[PDB]
Design an enzyme around this catalytic site. Structure first.
Site, PDB file in Angstrom:
ATOM      1  N   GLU A 270       0.827  -1.204   0.000  1.00 34.87           N
ATOM      2  CA  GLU A 270       0.000   0.000   0.000  1.00 34.87           C
ATOM      3  C   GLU A 270       0.869   1.266   0.000  1.00 34.87           C
ATOM      4  O   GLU A 270       0.511   2.270  -0.618  1.00 34.87           O
ATOM      5  CB  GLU A 270      -0.916   0.026   1.230  1.00 34.87           C
ATOM      6  CG  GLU A 270      -1.924  -1.116   1.299  1.00 34.87           C
ATOM      7  CD  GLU A 270      -2.697  -1.277   0.000  1.00 34.87           C
ATOM      8  OE1 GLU A 270      -3.140  -0.253  -0.572  1.00 34.87           O
ATOM      9  OE2 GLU A 270      -2.862  -2.425  -0.451  1.00 34.87           O
TER      10      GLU A 270
ATOM     11  N   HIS B  72       1.833   2.353  -3.336  1.00 31.96           N
ATOM     12  CA  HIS B  72       0.755   3.075  -3.997  1.00 31.96           C
ATOM     13  C   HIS B  72       0.762   4.513  -3.508  1.00 31.96           C
ATOM     14  O   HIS B  72       0.499   5.441  -4.274  1.00 31.96           O
ATOM     15  CB  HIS B  72      -0.605   2.452  -3.680  1.00 31.96           C
ATOM     16  CG  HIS B  72      -0.896   1.206  -4.458  1.00 31.96           C
ATOM     17  ND1 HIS B  72      -0.739   1.133  -5.825  1.00 31.96           N
ATOM     18  CD2 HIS B  72      -1.376   0.002  -4.067  1.00 31.96           C
ATOM     19  CE1 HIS B  72      -1.112  -0.064  -6.244  1.00 31.96           C
ATOM     20  NE2 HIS B  72      -1.503  -0.770  -5.197  1.00 31.96           N
TER      21      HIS B  72
HETATM   22 ZN   LIG Z   1      -2.411  -2.723  -5.141  1.00 31.05          ZN
END
Ligand SMILES: [Zn+2]
Ligand SMILES: [Zn+2]
EC number: 3.4.24.69
Length: 1287
Positions: free
Chosen positions: A230, A233
């Site tokens: 995450e 991201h």
């Molecule tokens: Zn992802």
């Protein structure tokens, strides 16, 4: 370094590190959330993420949010202060784990320092504007009870607890007026919903979860890696490179197709590994270009920023200095910023290909799933991450002090059970497809279990666009790779520029787009009467309330009765499994059936070398009935015919663009710029080939290899269902006995499961290898060639294009227009070999590829085999084969070419295979039977050469021809130069090994030599160094072409071509493989038959034959007569002489028509004595080593053995066979073998030695010697009349 702050949920609000925040999606209304600064610019809010979700949706319902996730619900998570505090301490611990290694600390440092640009697309180029929801977030300073006082702060990341689904972690960006700052170069505050306790579970197909199917299988994730996924991201969003482009969308037109959200390239880049390869080079560049463009905008802004209207206290210089370092712009001595291509390239690659889940997992020694496209499993709960006995900052679950470091044992479900807890299925929701029949019965199948097949729209068609070539124009390749080692040692990677202060003016413009989510039905009903993989797997199960089942080979009965379970194993296995025995025989039966299960499963290693297939799992079709009805008929045969394609549930329509034309730029008088254009178009041409191959690989991976992955998982499930069924039966049969009986029954259920499980693992390994081989086969034979076709066409178009260009510039090119004209010819001459490693560095995939390329059988580019009274190409390359009326074909794969004009075969080869390796590298192998010369036609036989196989194109090629007793191989290069090599067998031998007898030919060609091998032995060699290019893929014409006799013909068998030079070892092996048979052969090499007249030949006494002696019941041995005419060219011994024998079958009284004689068959050896059929006997009571055989009328005497067993003691190819007399079929008392013996005779008038047809025990030991003695007198051959031999 990175500092991770410490705190407790109940710690007092200080308005600095512990605040009351107003989340971006709150639109500046509602209550605030207590937030904790875990690090600079990073905040943790220990509460459920509710933005966009309905309150009741936090409860498990009949709906689901995501179609590809086993969703866990738990509305109570984080509902108490103590729960909130546990969340905080856990996040702190995870951040510590992350920074415990350089790679992770750098990821955190990049995130902390990647502050969002002060503004977005709506902001004037000359200003910074902090008053927007993606840059500033508010904190309440005032006393509890009024929003009277607030303060603004800059922030990079806000981590919340989970939304309705605990295991659905997500990173969210901020959109305003339909646009996203994080997608346009600016970056913006990022948010995340995360849960550390409920983690995902995965299992490797190509591996095995601790080799225990009965035990728990799979591995659970390390929450620190989930978090870092995450964070990657977040990183992308902060640098404003989380751009959108052509996504991978799943085809959903068929009921067996898996439905899911479109998948963006950024998601695949974030995971890493093989997934980036599913993003074509075209799209890789599109994204690259979009991001670069985003950065150009930012660099221009830095050159134009003058003020910050929203916050007069913002120090412009500090931010310009910071943004300069963030984006790695360069600055001249004046202060002018610009983009440095080299630095941008490094930053881009570091952010997209350096920081990836796969790369981080490898670095932290954490195991994760093999690919984004792999079945997802139900999550599990981690008992206590805060317990250093279970999970540590340094090693996660894989703690060495607990010997859980090796093989990721700490994450193994079967091993580290103290670390987790399974989840109540009552709280899980899964999207299922209810497959209903038009009646009715319905089967529920989880969407995850279906076939993911990317839709054609998923791939870019940019290759079809035109390209302008110029002296400038350069190659453009994006390496989806980045040396993690350097990233870790990058000296200027992390910023050393001051991080601006976070306090600022409070946000007043709360405008923002807030996502709105909602559940959809968790069950979708579809109608189909198809019985494919899903139905077949279902038929192998039984209800939980049932304990007495029986196996059946009938799929339909299995679906009908609950106590009937389908089995794809043998009829014998099934019958034995349903067998009921007495307690006394139970243990024995258990050992028997379990052993049978292992044997059945082990059939997964079946070889099929005669069909040129090294591995075949024969029961896959019966197991799944996947693809084109693989359950009907014989799977092995169907696979030999159609190959890997028959297993695919769906044949994808491939995107293979007509490559766009090139537009060259003119530069009159400028000799250099013109030459450069020519050279750039050439190097660009190679980029097109590479890009094309990349497009192919992406489609193969997302439309084909995905289907094969599902087949592998299906087989794993099928085998387990089989073992579970057998275990259920064993239990049931055992429990029928009383306790008294059980005590005396010796059984161990753990061992039973142990042996079954092991058998499964062995089968899985075989199946994995088989299927991976099939996948690569499809790529190389059904995909790559179609790309080569377009690329070759492109080359031709560009070829005339370049030459013509070299003409219009003829003048300005003066004395070189010709040098660079040939430059084009020689460049476009050599094509780019496809190499998968170029498009991916995934060890598993590369290994699959290399394995495939190491198997010589995959070099077969033509393999003509018989099927349904016709010849077809089974190489998999689809050559078109026209067999005309004059060709005779039989099911022994033999074909005859006669003197008739219509006795011909036309083969149109695939023009899209790298055959012309530029230096000439290929082999041809086949069996042939050439008839004997006609005695009164010897002159023409030795003089007239005739072609039999011709393959020419543009007057270049090869051909096989014959001139009497010589077979010739001829090559003709593009220039017309010629070279030949030949093999000539002797026509003056008393007995020839070649004339009219089947023999094996193999011709190999390499850079240096042309070699001819006969029956595996090298016979001839010719240096072909001077021979230039030879075009070998023209039409192959099989037909006798020359001044031949109308009676001339040739028999051939197993014609095949290899696009590589076979080794003497490869040839020897092929010879032995194609020579193999269960039956014996006759002198000519054809199958030996019952009820067929044969003269007999003796390999140890070639020139001798058997004749019934006039006055006695014995076979005298005489000398064969010979060719009597006066030709100087020929000599031979007569073969049609002596008694005419005939082999009769002993068993089954099915009359006496005809049939095939197999090794070990019991027979009668008879012969004709005028109008009667006599038999060969052995007097039973002889005591010497040997005795003369007894020939007499057919009858049954107590004093004579009449039964013979035909044998083959030679392990190597031979047309010889042996004849054994045993006391009787059952006994092991061997009387001896039939042969020839020398006797001395001394009578009143004559004294001499004479040979007789006998039986001797001496041969019994001799036939065991190695190498086999072919000269033994017990070696016989049967000679039937044959049109190919006249005397
Ligand atoms: Zn992802
Ligand atoms: Zn999938």
């Amino acid at each position: 370094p990175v500092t991770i702050n410490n705190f407790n949920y109940n710690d007092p609000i200080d308005n600095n590190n512990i605040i009351m925040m107003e989340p971006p999606f709150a639109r500046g209304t509602g209550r605030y959330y207590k937030a904790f600064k875990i690090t600079d610019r990073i905040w943790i809010i220990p509460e459920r993420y509710t933005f966009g979700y309905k309150p009741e949706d936090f409860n498990k319902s009949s709906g689901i949010f995501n179609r590809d996730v086993c969703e866990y619900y738990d509305p109570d998570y984080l509902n108490t202060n103590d729960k909130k505090n546990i969340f905080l301490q856990t996040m702190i611990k995870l951040f510590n784990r992350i920074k415990s290694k350089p790679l992770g600390e750098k990821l955190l440092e990049m995130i902390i320092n990647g502050i969002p640009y002060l503004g977005d697309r709506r902001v004037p180029l000359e200003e910074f504007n902090t008053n927007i929801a993606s840059v500033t977030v508010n904190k309440l300073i005032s006393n509890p009870g009024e929003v009277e006082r607030k303060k603004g702060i800059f922030a990079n990341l806000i981590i919340f607890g989970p939304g309705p689904v605990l295991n659905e972690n997500e990173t969210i960006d901020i959109g305003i007026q339909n646009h996203f700052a994080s997608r346009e170069g600016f970056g913006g505050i990022m948010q995340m919903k995360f849960c550390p306790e409920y983690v995902s579970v995965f299992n490797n197909v190509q591996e095995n979860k601790g080799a225990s199917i009965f035990n728990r299988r799979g591995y659970f994730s390390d929450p620190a890696l989930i978090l870092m996924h995450e964070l990657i991201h977040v990183l992308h969003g902060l640098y404003g490179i989380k751009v959108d482009d052509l996504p991978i969308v799943p085809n959903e037109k068929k009921f067996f197709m898996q439905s899911t959200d479109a998948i963006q390239a950024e998601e695949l880049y974030t995971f890493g590994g093989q997934d980036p390869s599913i993003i074509t080079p075209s799209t890789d560049k599109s994204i690259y270009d979009k991001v670069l463009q985003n950065f150009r905008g930012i660099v221009d802004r830095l050159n134009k920023v003058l003020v910050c209207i929203s916050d007069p206290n913002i120090n412009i210089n500090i931010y310009k200095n910071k943004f300069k370092d963030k984006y790695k712009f360069v600055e001249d001595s004046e202060g002018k910023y610009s983009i440095d291509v080299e630095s941008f390239d490094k930053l881009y690659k570091s952010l997209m290909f350096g920081f990836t889940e796969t790369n981080i997992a490898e670095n932290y020694k954490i195991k994760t799933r093999a690919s984004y496209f792999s079945d997802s499993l139900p999550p599990v709960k981690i008992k206590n991450l805060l317990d250093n006995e279970i999970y540590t900052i340094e090693e996660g679950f894989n703690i060495s002090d607990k010997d859980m470091e090796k093989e990721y044992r700490g994450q193994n479900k079967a091993i580290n059970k103290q670390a987790y807890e399974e989840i109540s299925k009552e709280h899980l929701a899964v999207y299922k497809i209810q497959m209903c029949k038009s009646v009715g019965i319905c089967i529920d199948v989880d969407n995850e279990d279906l076939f993911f097949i990317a839709d054609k729209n998923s791939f870019s068609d940019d290759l079809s666009k035109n390209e302008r070539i110029e002296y400038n124009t350069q190659s453009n390749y994006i390496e989806n790779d980045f040396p993690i080692n350097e990233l870790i040692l990058d000296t200027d990677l992390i910023s050393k520029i001051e991080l601006p202060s976070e306090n600022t003016e409070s946000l007043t413009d709360f405008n923002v787009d807030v996502p709105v989510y909602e559940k959809q039905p968790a069950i979708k009903k579809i109608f189909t009467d198809e019985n494919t993989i899903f139905q077949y797997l279902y038929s192998q199960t039984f209800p939980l309330d049932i304990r007495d089942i029986s196996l059946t080979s009938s799929f339909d009965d299995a679906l009908l009765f609950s106590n009937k379970v389908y089995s794809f194993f043998s009829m014998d296995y099934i019958k034995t499994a349903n067998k009921v025995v007495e307690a006394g025989l139970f243990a024995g039966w258990v050992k028997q059936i379990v052993n049978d299960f292992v044997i059945e499963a082990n059939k997964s290693n079946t070889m099929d070398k005669i069909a040129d297939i090294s591995l075949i799992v024969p029961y896959i079709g019966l197991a799944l009935n996947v693809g084109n009805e693989t359950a009907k008929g014989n799977f092995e045969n169907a696979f030999e015919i159609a190959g890997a394609s028959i297993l695919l549930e769906f044949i994808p329509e491939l995107l293979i663009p007509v490559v766009g034309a090139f537009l060259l730029e003119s530069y009159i008088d400028n000799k250099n710029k013109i030459i450069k254009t020519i050279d750039n178009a050439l190097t660009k041409r190679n980029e097109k080939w590479s890009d094309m191959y990349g497009l192919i690989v992406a489609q193969w991976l997302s439309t084909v290899n995905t289907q094969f992955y599902t087949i592998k998982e299906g087989m794993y499930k099928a085998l387990n269902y089989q073992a579970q069924a057998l275990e259920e039966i064993i239990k049931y049969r055992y429990n029928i006995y009383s306790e008294k009986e059980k005590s005396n029954i010796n059984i161990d259920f753990n061992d039973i499961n142990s042996k079954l499980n092991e058998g499964i693992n062995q089968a899985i390994d075989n199946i994995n290898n088989f299927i991976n081989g099939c996948s690569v086969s499809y790529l190389m034979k059904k995909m790559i060639p179609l790309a080569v076709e377009k690329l070759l066409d492109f080359d031709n178009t560009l070829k005339k294009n370049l030459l013509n260009y070299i003409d219009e510039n003829k003048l300005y090119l003066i004395g070189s227009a010709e040098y660079e004209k040939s430059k084009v010819n020689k460049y476009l001459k050599t094509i780019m070999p496809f190499d998968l490693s170029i498009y991916t560095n995934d060890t598993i995939l590369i290994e699959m590829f290399n394995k495939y390329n190491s198997e010589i059988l995959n070099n077969i580019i033509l393999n003509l085999r018989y099927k349904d009274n016709n010849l077809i190409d089974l190489s998999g390359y689809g050559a078109k084969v026209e067999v005309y009326d004059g060709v005779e074909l039989n099911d022994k794969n033999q074909f005859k070419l006669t003197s008739s004009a219509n006795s011909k075969i036309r083969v149109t080869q695939n023009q899209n295979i790298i055959f012309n390796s530029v230096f000439l590298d290929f082999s041809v192998s086949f069996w042939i039977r050439i008839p004997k010369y006609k005695n009164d036609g010897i002159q023409n036989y030795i003089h007239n050469e005739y072609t039999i196989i011709n393959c020419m194109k543009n007057n270049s090629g090869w051909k096989i021809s014959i001139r009497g007793n010589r077979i010739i191989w001829t090559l003709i290069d593009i220039n017309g130069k010629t070279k030949s090599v030949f093999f000539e067998y002797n026509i003056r031998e008393d007995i020839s090994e070649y004339i009219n007898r089947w023999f094996f030919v193999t011709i190999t060609n390499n850079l240096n030599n042309a070699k001819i091998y006969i029956n595996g032995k090298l016979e001839s060699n010719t240096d072909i160094k001077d021979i230039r290019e030879v075009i070998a893929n023209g039409e192959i014409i099989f037909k006798l072409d020359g001044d031949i006799d109308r009676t001339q013909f040739i028999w051939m068998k197993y014609f095949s071509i290899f696009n590589t030079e076979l080794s003497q070892s490869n040839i020897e092996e092929r010879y032995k493989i194609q020579s193999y048979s269960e039956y014996l052969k006759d002198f000519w090499g054809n199958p030996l038959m019952y009820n067929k007249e044969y003269y007999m030949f003796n390999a140890g006494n070639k020139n001798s034959y058997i004749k019934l002696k006039k006055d006695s019941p014995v076979g005298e041995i005489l000398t064969r007569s010979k060719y009597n005419q006066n030709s100087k060219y020929i000599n031979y011994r007569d073969l049609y002489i002596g008694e005419k024998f005939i082999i009769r079958r002993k068993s089954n009284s099915q009359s006496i028509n005809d049939d095939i004689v197999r090794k070990e068959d019991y027979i009668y050896l008879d012969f004709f004595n005028l109008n009667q059929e006599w038999r060969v006997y052995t007097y039973k009571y002889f005591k010497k080593e040997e005795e003369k055989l007894f020939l007499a009328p057919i009858s049954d005497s107590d004093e004579f053995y009449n039964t013979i067993q035909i044998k083959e003691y030679d392990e190597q190819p031979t047309y010889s066979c042996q004849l054994l007399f045993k006391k009787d079929e059952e006994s092991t008392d061997e009387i001896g073998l039939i042969g020839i013996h020398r006797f001395y005779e001394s009578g009143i008038v004559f004294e001499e030695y004479k040979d007789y047809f006998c039986i001797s025990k001496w041969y019994l030991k001799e036939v065991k010697r190695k190498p086999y003695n072919l000269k033994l007198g017990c070696n016989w051959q049967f000679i039937p009349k044959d049109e190919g031999w006249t005397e």
